Amino acid sequence: GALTESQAALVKSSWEEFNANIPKHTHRFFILVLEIAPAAKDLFSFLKGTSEVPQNNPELQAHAGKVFKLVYEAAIQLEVTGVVVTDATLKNLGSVHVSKGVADAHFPVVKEAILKTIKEVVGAKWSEELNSAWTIAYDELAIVIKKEMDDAA
Ligand code: HEM
Numbered sequence: 001g002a003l004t005e006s007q008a009a010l011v012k013s014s015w016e017e018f019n020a021n022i023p024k025h026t027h028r029f030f031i032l033v034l035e036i037a038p039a040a041k042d043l044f045s046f047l048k049g050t051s052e053v054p055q056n057n058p059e060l061q062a063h064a065g066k067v068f069k070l071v072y073e074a075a076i077q078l079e080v081t082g083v084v085v086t087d088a089t090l091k092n093l094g095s096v097h098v099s100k101g102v103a104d105a106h107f108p109v110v111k112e113a114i115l116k117t118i119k120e121v122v123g124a125k126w127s128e129e130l131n132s133a134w135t136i137a138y139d140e141l142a143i144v145i146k147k148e149m150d151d152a153a
């Protein structure tokens with residue numbers, strides 16, 4: 001689909017819609033995670049010892065916000081430039097996932113959880129053209145982190 005001027009315009013618009021509600025969209029995101037794979041719970045410091053996903057934990061929120069920002073920035077960078085750029089951050093990202101016990105087969109867990117999360121966020125505006133646009137941008141960014149994990153291992 002490439003990322004036409006028209007597709008980019010579609011991701012920006014839908015990201016703005018997400019940040020518009022972080023405590024919601026972020027706790028939703030962790031539930032769609034534990035739906036797709038329950039075991040994942042022992043991994044997060046702020047989920048261990050708990051029984052349910054904390055709803056107002058600042059550690060949790062600041063964590064999940066950072067995750068979606070990174071996927072959006074990725075899509076514009078693809079329409080403008082044509083690529084996703086690897087920096088210091090994405091590399092420190094890759095280290096911390098390894099310390100914590102995270103693997104690659106974990107990644108379609110977090111993707112579906114994010115496409116389903118954005119399908120929920122845009123509702124009727126949803127198009128093929130948009131699904132195509134966030135699918136392209138996640139896949140392009142995941143390709144880049146998995147790359148830094150394998151490197152931190
Ligand atoms: C494009 C895809 C992904 C993005 C953009 C992303 C982003 C992030 C960020 C920004 C942090 C916090 C880093 C810090 O500041 O110290 C982090 C932590 C973490 N990540 Fe991910 N991530 C991705 C995929 C995954 C996957 C597939 C898993 C596995 C379920 C995972 C599990 C974790 C865990 C356990 C931590 C530690 C949190 C703690 O215990 O405090 N991530 N991630």
Ligand SMILES: [C-]#N
Binds near residue numbers: 067110
């Ligand atoms: C990362 N979640």
